[PDB]
């Protein structure tokens, strides 16, 4: 053919059927799935639908607060950066023999959010008891509509897939107690959450409210001056997020001591090093709060490193990694015709107008 | 002039004077020193001797077992790779506001050993309480005579400079107790060292013996199968080194618990990744042994990364780095005349013999 840049890999147009994705034992062929998705390939709508629904079924049976044993690899934001997710697994260990805990924000901003969702759900189906996924603030309708995920589904698949994902996200657990010592959540604490039991009492199967316990777990952040506060206010309204709160060092310590916890592990905020450790607790000498962020070179501009936390007996190994190359996409998943047509039109019109003078 | 490859930098012929290297307060101008040594420039012999002798005076006052508090950047083997040492300080932080601890093996193999020594000694003179240097097994007469340091000193300076270095190496501390948690040594343990006090009793001011505690500190290695050993002997003779021992995982663990220590930090063995963390102790769940190796692309052939260990209470950061460009030197520091004359005298004589036969 007359394809100009031969060097560049052409995406397969063949869509994987149920037969090729699921073996006769009901288990998904994640390795085949990976290779296909990495080539920017698609699955038949019905197959993606099956992956999403079966994954939801499993998540739906889990508890608001997961009980996770060490060792485990804890990961922060992914935001549709599928190619960085592939490397994340090299760095953190194969899910075939590695326990995983994701803190949310799998979609939006990145242009491969559906692939991230399909691969992670496929992995969740295959490793029901060793790979865990928490809800992040972006795993909802309100944000995927404003950002890019809803549009991504409509262009690559259909709104039907988007709706199925929205229902799946509603099933996502809100937090996890890891090794009986760490409270893991996407955002943070809530003035309405004094004990782990307050988390169990919540009704998570729904769109996140604009305020309240569930909202705070998904949206709160530590104060900008966390640990060096000049305001004894434990919880102050988060004007940056437009909802929820900013929690202070004293607020965290109180919750930690009262609940016999060592630290709060969370994501939600980009970190140049892929992680950030905050002021140590006075009681244990261990970081009261740790932010983990897994999206290297976030938004293709920040050049930040990403990291994941491998926790073993009394040893926390933060592993950093850089970004990987990924395919190009026009804003809003626009095709070149829609993109260039308006310009072509006015330029041909302009040409004929000048000539007719 | 005749000079063919004009783009290549030419080393200065001027030898830095005493007033150029030392100022009124008796402090070394490390920045002028650095810049000059990087162009392969020399110092006046007397100035070299002054740096070496003054550094020695400082070293001579220190104890066999140094007490180094956190934070600190622990470095491994350098082996005369001066240009990588410049990179090392860039990655590990300025000596001006960073505490350092080098585990030895500053010379031999690399062709810029004297530069490494003069720079580190000058730094020791400038930062006596923040820059620490331990003795490695190469910091002695026996090895420097066999390898390259002696010949380097003779060609670039004089045997007097060599002798002064040998005197200074005898003053080098043998170990360090870092942050009251880690025992730091070049090589490792000794069957004759059951406590940290045993190290204090030793007389270090002499050429290292072919056997005994001092020898073991500088020469021992962990077993090849360390941690996964079916070998019941804690200490077995080191047939690879030709002296000292191979210590097992049990030996280390027994020694760590008995001295209430967290881990042994050493160098002595090249690592592809610049470092290595061995089997976790069953008493602390922390790596029982850690090897730090700071010479990148060792011997210009290994293609290995180098690394330094930046530490602060309970936070260990392993920073890696790749090699840097460095000037070329013929083996044994030969000049082109000594290198080719034998060939010339042979080829000419070879021509005439055939011409006359």
């Amino acid at each position: 053919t007359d394809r100009v840049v031969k060097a560049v890999p052409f995406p397969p147009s063949h869509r994987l059927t149920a037969k090729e994705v699921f073996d006769n034992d009901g288990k998904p062929r994640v390795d085949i799935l990976k290779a296909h998705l990495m080539k920017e390939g698609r699955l038949e709508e019905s197959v993606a639908l099956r992956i999403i629904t079966e994954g939801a079924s499993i998540l739906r049976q889990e508890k608001n607060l997961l009980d996770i044993d060490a060792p485990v690899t804890v990961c922060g934001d992914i935001h549709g950066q599928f190619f960085d997710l592939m490397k994340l697994f090299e760095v953190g260990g194969s899910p075939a023999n590695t326990r995983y805990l994701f803190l949310g924000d799998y979609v939006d901003r990145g242009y491969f959010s559906i692939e991230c969702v399909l691969y992670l759900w496929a992995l969740k189906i295959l490793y029901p008891k060793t790979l865990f996924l928490l809800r992040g603030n972006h795993e909802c309708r309100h944000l995927t509509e404003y950002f890019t995920f809803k549009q991504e589904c409509k262009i690559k698949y259909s709104e039907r897939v988007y709706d199925a994902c929205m229902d799946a996200f509603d099933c996502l657990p809100l937090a996890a107690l890891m090794n009986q010592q760490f409270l893991c959540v996407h955002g943070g604490l809530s003035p309405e959450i004094n004990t782990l039991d307050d988390i169990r009492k919540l009704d998570r199967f729904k769109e996140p409210p604009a305020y309240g316990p569930m909202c705070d777990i998904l949206w709160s952040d530590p104060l900008e001056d966390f640990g060096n506060e000049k305001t004894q206010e434990h919880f102050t309204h988060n004007t940056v997020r437009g909802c929820s709160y900013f929690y202070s060092y004293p607020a965290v310590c109180e919750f930690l001591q009262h609940n016999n916890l060592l630290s709060i592990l969370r994501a939600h905020e980009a970190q140049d090093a892929g992680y950030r450790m905050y002021r140590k607790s006075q009681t244990t000498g261990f970081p009261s709060l740790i932010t983990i962020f897994s999206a290297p070179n976030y938004l293709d501009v920040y050049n930040n490193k990403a990291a994941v936390l491998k926790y073993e007996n009394n040893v926390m190994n933060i592993r950093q990694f850089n970004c990987s190359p990924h395919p190009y996409w026009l804003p809003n998943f626009m095709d070149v015709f829609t993109w260039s047509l308006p310009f072509v039109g006015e330029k041909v019109t302009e040409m004929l107008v000048n000539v007719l003078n | 002039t005749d000079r063919v490859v004009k783009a290549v930098p030419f080393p200065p012929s001027h030898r830095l004077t005493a007033k150029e290297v030392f100022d009124n307060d008796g402090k070394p101008r490390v920045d002028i020193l650095k810049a000059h040594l990087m162009k392969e420039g020399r110092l006046e012999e007397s100035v070299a001797l002054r740096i070496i002798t003054e550094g020695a005076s400082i070293l001579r006052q220190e104890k066999n077992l140094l007490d180094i508090d956190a934070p600190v950047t622990v470095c491994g083997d350098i082996h005369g790779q001066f240009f990588d040492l410049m990179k090392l300080f860039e990655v590990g932080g300025s000596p001006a506001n960073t505490r350092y601890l080098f585990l030895g093996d500053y010379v031999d193999r690399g062709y810029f050993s004297i530069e490494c020594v003069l720079y580190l000694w000058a730094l020791k003179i400038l930062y006596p309480k923040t820059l620490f240097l331990l003795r490695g097994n190469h910091e002695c007469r026996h090895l420097t005579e066999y390898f390259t340091f002696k010949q380097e000193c003779k060609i670039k300076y004089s045997e007097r400079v060599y002798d002064a270095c040998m005197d200074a190496f005898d003053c080098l501390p043998l170990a360090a107790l870092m942050n009251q948690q880690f025992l730091c040594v070049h090589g490792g343990l000794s069957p004759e060292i059951n406590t940290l006090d045993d190290i204090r009793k030793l007389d270090r001011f002499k050429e290292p013996p072919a056997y005994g505690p001092m020898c073991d500190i500088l020469w021992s290695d962990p077993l090849e199968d360390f941690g996964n050993e079916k070998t019941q002997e804690h200490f077995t003779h080191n047939t690879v080194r030709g002296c000292s021992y191979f210590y097992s995982y049990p030996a280390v663990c027994e020694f760590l618990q008995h001295n209430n220590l967290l881990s042994i930090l050493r160098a002595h063995e090249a690592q592809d990744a610049g470092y290595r963390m061995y089997r976790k102790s069953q008493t602390t769940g922390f790596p029982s042994l850690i090897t730090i190796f700071s010479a990148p692309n060792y011997l210009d052939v290994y293609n290995n990364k180098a690394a330094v260990l930046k530490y602060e209470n309970n936070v260990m950061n392993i920073r890696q780095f790749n090699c840097s460009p460095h000037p070329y030197w013929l083996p044994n520091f030969m000049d082109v005349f000594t290198w080719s004359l034998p060939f010339v005298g042979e080829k000419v004589t070879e021509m005439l013999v055939n011409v006359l036969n």
Binding site: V91, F286, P287, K305, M316, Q320 | N314, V315, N317
Partner: peptide, 13 residues
């Protein structure tokens, strides 16, 4: 009694 933190990388592979 509490875990120690070891930071490594960027793990290129």
């Amino acid at each position: 009694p509490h875990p120690v933190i070891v930071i490594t990388g960027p793990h290129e592979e």
